[PDB]
Design a protein around this ligand. Structure first.
Ligand SMILES: NC(=O)C1=CN([C@@H]2O[C@H](COP(=O)(O)OP(=O)(O)OC[C@H]3O[C@@H](n4cnc5c(N)ncnc54)[C@H](OP(=O)(O)O)[C@@H]3O)[C@@H](O)[C@H]2O)C=CC1
Ligand SMILES: [Zn+2]
Lengths: 82, 114, 125, 290, 94, 206, 143
């Protein structure tokens, strides 16, 4: 019972190039598909990108997206959402 | 980085100095409860020595260990020679104060103790 | 005659300070802000280390300010953030650090108060 | 709640504990510890006295500056008890003699005075009243002291239903009339320490699950009178006193005990050595159950 | 002047009284509450206004020393008086 | 002038010359010789030159610095070697005084000089008790001014003024027990230092 | 206690900003933190301590014991709330607007007036400014 997704990423670093690509490519489509889902884009400086996904009764998971490409990031995103 | 040492080259020699000091203390302990009429038992005294030794176990620096040995020797002198008193020795057990409870709730309920 | 000990430095077991006041604390390293009341800057030149404040209650007898923290009036002065932080680490205190907020250089032109075209023109001399 | 009561501090001499306690029976032997336990955490302590001011000087140093208030009274004099119960949240009664004088019978001491104390407390508007009695308190008793105690407990409850009775057993410490009485020169005893009793009372002074109840403060062990007196003599005149001596200690069933206030029994086998070395110029006693 | 409160306690020159529900009233039992009965806020009011023929007047309190620092007061505002911040006296311009 | 202090340069000359003298005799164990406005001579040295320099000054015929007026320590917690050590020395043959300074820290002791001056037997114990600084080859080294169970070095800059513990008599145990410190009037910290520079001669550069 | 406290069933006193270390954020994403100046009055406590103890009682014991742990939680949820004094750039307004362009909702006729027109309303905008007996002097003087 997923309740929230939150991507944490960086800028001007390789680790987050795939995540920026994902954001430009497929984020509007994801939102319009499931609009009532909270997707929290959160960028900072000198982090290692992660995707914290939070389920119903107070649990959540995470996966490092460092040195990952846009297609792999979309793979992990769909894995989580599924 | 590189340093200048004090009374030791490595933690092994430091630990053997420590063990000599523990021999001395452990052996002397009962003479104190005899000379000065303490209420506590030799078991309590020895447990206290062990506690005060293990309180500084994480230490790694031979110098920080040699200084603790020095200070323990000073204390043992003050004790075997009757310069300390019942008061100074019983200042180790804290018989007249309750400790800060190690419970978030027991703290919150009374004060801002974090 | 020299030894090598590269491990982090600690003197906590020699300071004699207790656990309650060596782990339950939070120290602050900063430069004291200038008092906007005065325009002197001979106080924003040395770094200072202070502690977190604690309970300060009222005596029932006379109304005075009573405490139990013996490090409430403890303030230390340093000439360098590196030395301040080294001392903090040495002693074993969790520290927050602030940066030296220096004012910006400003362009001043007494002639700007009399321009023929600009808004900087002043209405009272 | 009044801001003057909010317990600000860290539990120390110069702190505040929100405990305003009027204590009767401080010039004695158990008050000497009750007052210390009250004051060393920052409580206000009204002490009425009838003695001369010299016999009440061992109490001026056990509390911080301004927390102790010594005033005078007279049991027969009413309106000398309003003064003391007013301006308080807790009242503690520790009065009691081991004998009878001319002016004061056991009846008076244990029935008539506590009753007036509780009446004045209720009148004032205090919120806690603590009374101390004996473990063997019972109307069926060779000693009329215990008779009067078991009568006075009811005479108190009839005016202060939410009171708190505390029945300890033979108490042993320094300046006690039990071990020193034995060493001056069929029955099982379970004595208890003034430290434990005072800790219990001072805890009940705040604990919320103590009102309208009773407590049997007894030690951890039990001993046969003979083994205990022989232990005394190895470590080394009143009819009612001897009567209270020749009575065994009850094992009160399921009554809220000492470990329900948080205190823990301190065995006599640890403090006898400090209490008895004064009477000088060994193995322990076999604890038993009947 | 000292005027008593419901509880029966005298009020001070700064309005201090232990609330009737206050436990701190114990210290006064069998004792008293030390209070000053001479209120400056009234004793100075009892004094009259000085008059001067100059719009600026210097006050020191009396003796050159034994008084207070010489301060100068303006008397252009006939609506009110000119008060000294040290001694409380007040002057007028006539 | 009547409000300012006189100023003699003969002493400045003598002491600068003696500074050069001492420093060229001991180019080792020496650094930062300085003679000040008020005509006092300081010589800073390395912790390995204590006994050499003290012996030289005491015995050398030109120096005869016999009396150990004082031994002291000073805590500056902004420098890696935080414990300055100061020997104030006196010579009667010349009516002269000198200051010899070295440095130390925690875990980095100094050499004792009871062999040179026996007065130090107690000054060094006092330094160890107050600032926490060990000395090598000291016969007895133990608490001298503080209580027997005192844990701390109170003349440091980080040790609080009022301390960490406090004593009082408790009737229960019939002793003078120690406890945490709970004051009825917290010492007030007056911030006095002014924002306006008072001495430009000491103005540090930014 | 101004509006929501009287219409309450349980009331838990807490600590203001002069009485707690706590992060706030301004309109530009600059995270800043207060520093305790005066401990709270009486039984008042810190809000996160209150909620933590409440969960511990209920049986939902949280993992936050200290402020540093709560700050690491803030870091996990959003990593900007611990880079104090530092703003963080953003570059996704194109997507924001791409999406927002597909939101049909018509504006209305009534103008858009500001609630604060005269200085009379600058004062008394929060419970502290309603409690202040000086802001009242200023309002009265204005009127
Ligand atoms: N120890 C025991 O064997 C047990 C004792 N208790 C209870 O312990 C309580 C105290 O024990 P203890 O401390 O030995 O009592 P103490 O005799 O030590 O002192 C008790 C106080 O009672 C006061 N007092 C006694 N009679 C009168 C009176 N007629 N008028 C005014 N004041 C009076 C005395 O005040 P002053 O000294 O000023 O005259 C005295 O300070 C007693 O109430 C007793 O019931 C209960 C169970 C066991
Ligand atoms: Zn005047």
């Amino acid at each position: 019972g997923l309740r929230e997704i939150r991507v944490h990423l960086c800028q001007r670093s390789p680790g987050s190039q795939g995540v920026r690509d994902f954001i430009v490519q497929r984020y509007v489509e994801l939102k319009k598909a499931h609009p009532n889902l909270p997707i929290l884009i959160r960028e900072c400086s000198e982090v290692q990108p992660k995707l914290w996904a939070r389920y119903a009764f107070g649990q959540e998971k995470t996966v490092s997206l460092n040195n990952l490409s846009a297609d792999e990031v979309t793979r992990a995103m769909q894995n989580v959402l599924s | 980085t590189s340093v200048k040492p004090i009374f030791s080259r490595d933690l092994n020699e430091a630990k053997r100095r420590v063990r000599e000091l523990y021999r001395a203390w452990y052996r002397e302990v009962p003479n104190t409860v005899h000379l000065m009429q303490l209420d506590i038992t030799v078991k309590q005294g020895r447990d206290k020595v062990r506690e005060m030794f293990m309180k500084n176990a994480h230490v790694t620096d031979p110098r920080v260990v040699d200084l603790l040995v020095i200070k323990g020797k000073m204390e043992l002198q003050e004790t075997i020679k009757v310069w300390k008193q019942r008061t100074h020795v019983m200042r180790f057990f804290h018989e007249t104060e309750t400790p800060r409870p190690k419970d978030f709730l027991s703290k919150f309920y009374m004060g801002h103790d974090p | 005659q020299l030894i090598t000990v590269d491990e982090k430095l600690d003197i906590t077991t020699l300071t004699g300070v207790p656990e309650e006041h060596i782990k339950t604390r939070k120290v602050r390293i900063f430069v004291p802000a200038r008092n906007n009341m005065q325009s002197g800057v001979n106080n924003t030149k040395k770094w200072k280390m202070e502690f977190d404040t604690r309970e300060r209650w009222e005596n029932p007898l006379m109304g005075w300010a009573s405490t139990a923290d013996p490090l409430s009036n403890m303030v230390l002065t340093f000439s360098a953030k590196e030395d301040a932080i080294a001392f903090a680490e040495k002693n074993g205190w969790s520290y927050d650090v602030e940066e030296k907020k220096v004012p910006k250089p400003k362009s001043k032109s007494y002639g700007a108060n009399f321009s023929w075209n600009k808004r900087t023109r002043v209405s009272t001399k | 709640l009044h801001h003057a009561v909010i317990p600000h501090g860290k539990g120390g001499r110069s702190s505040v504990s929100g405990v305003v306690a009027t204590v009767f029976g401080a010039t004695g032997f158990l008050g000497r510890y009750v007052v210390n336990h009250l004051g060393r955490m920052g409580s206000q302590v009204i002490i009425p006295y009838r003695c001369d001011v010299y016999d009440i000087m061992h109490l001026r140093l056990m509390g911080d500056l301004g927390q102790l208030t010594f005033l005078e009274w007279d049991a027969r004099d009413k309106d000398s008890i309003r003064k003391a119960v007013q301006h308080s949240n807790v009242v503690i009664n520790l009065i009691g003699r081991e004998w009878e004088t001319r002016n004061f019978d056991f009846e008076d001491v244990f029935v008539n005075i506590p009753r007036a104390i509780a009446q004045a407390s209720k009148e004032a508007g205090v919120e806690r009243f603590i009374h101390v009695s004996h473990l063997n308190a019972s109307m069926k008793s060779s000693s009329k002291s215990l008779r009067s105690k078991a009568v006075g407990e009811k005479e108190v409850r009839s005016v202060f239903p939410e009171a708190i009775i505390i029945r300890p057993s033979d108490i042993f410490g320094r300046e006690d009339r039990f071990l020193n009485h034995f060493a001056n020169y069929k029955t099982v005893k379970q004595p208890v320490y003034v430290a434990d009793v005072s800790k219990g009372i001072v805890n009940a002074t705040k604990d919320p699950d103590a009102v309208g109840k009773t407590f049997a403060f007894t030690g951890p062990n039990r001993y046969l009178l003979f083994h205990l007196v022989k232990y005394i003599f190895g470590m080394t005149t009143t009819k009612d006193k001897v009567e209270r001596i020749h009575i065994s200690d009850v094992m009160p069933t399921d009554l809220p005990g000492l470990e329900d206030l948080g205190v823990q029994p301190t065995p006599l086998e640890l403090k006898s050595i400090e209490v008895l070395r004064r009477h000088r110029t060994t193995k322990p006693a076999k604890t038993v159950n009947y | 002047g000292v005027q008593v409160s419901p509880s029966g306690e005298k009020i001070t020159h700064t309005g201090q009284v232990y609330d009737e529900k206050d436990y701190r009233r114990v210290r006064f039992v069998d004792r008293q509450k030390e209070v000053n009965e001479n209120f400056a806020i009234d004793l100075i009011a009892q004094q009259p206004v000085n008059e001067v023929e100059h719009r600026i007047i210097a006050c020191d309190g009396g003796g050159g020393a034994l008084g207070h620092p010489k301060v100068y007061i303006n008397l252009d505002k006939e609506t009110k008086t000119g008060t000294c911040g040290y001694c409380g006296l007040q002057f007028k311009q006539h | 002038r009547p409000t300012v202090r006189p100023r003699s340069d003969v002493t400045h000359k003598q002491l600068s010359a003696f500074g050069e003298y001492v420093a060229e005799i001991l180019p080792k164990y020496v650094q930062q010789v300085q003679v000040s406005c008020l005509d006092e001579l300081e010589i800073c040295i390395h912790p390995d030159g204590v006994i050499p320099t003290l012996t030289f000054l005491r015995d050398h015929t030109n120096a005869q610095f016999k009396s150990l007026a004082d031994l002291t320590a000073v805590d500056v917690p902004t420098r890696q070697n935080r414990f300055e050590i100061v020997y104030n020395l006196l010579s009667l043959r010349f009516n002269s005084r000198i200051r010899v300074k070295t440095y130390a820290d925690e875990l980095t002791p100094i050499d004792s000089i009871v062999s040179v001056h026996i007065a130090a037997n107690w000054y060094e114990r006092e330094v160890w008790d107050m600032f926490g600084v060990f000395f090598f080859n000291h016969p007895d080294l133990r608490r001298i001014l503080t209580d027997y169970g005192f844990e701390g070095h109170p003349f440091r800059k980080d040790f609080p003024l009022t301390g960490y513990v406090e004593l009082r008599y408790d009737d229960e145990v019939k002793r003078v027990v120690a406890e945490p410190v709970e004051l009825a009037q917290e010492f007030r910290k007056f911030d006095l230092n002014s924002p306006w520079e008072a001495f430009p001669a000491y103005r540090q550069p930014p | 206690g101004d509006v929501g406290a009287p219409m309450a069933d349980v009331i838990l006193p807490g600590a203001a900003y002069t009485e707690k270390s706590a992060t706030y954020v301004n309109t530009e994403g600059r995270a800043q933190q207060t520093k305790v100046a005066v401990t709270p009055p009486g039984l008042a406590r810190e809000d996160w301590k209150i909620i933590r103890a409440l969960s511990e009682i209920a049986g939902i014991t949280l993992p936050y014991d200290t402020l540093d742990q709560v700050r690491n939680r803030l870091e996990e949820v959003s990593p900007n709330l611990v880079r104090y004094d530092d703003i963080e750039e953003t570059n996704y307004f194109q997507q924001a607007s791409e999406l927002a362009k597909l939101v049909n909702q018509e504006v209305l006729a009534d103008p858009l007036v500001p609630p604060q027109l005269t200085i009379k309303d600058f004062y008394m905008t929060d419970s502290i400014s309603r409690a202040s007996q000086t802001m009242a002097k200023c309002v009265k003087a204005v009127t």
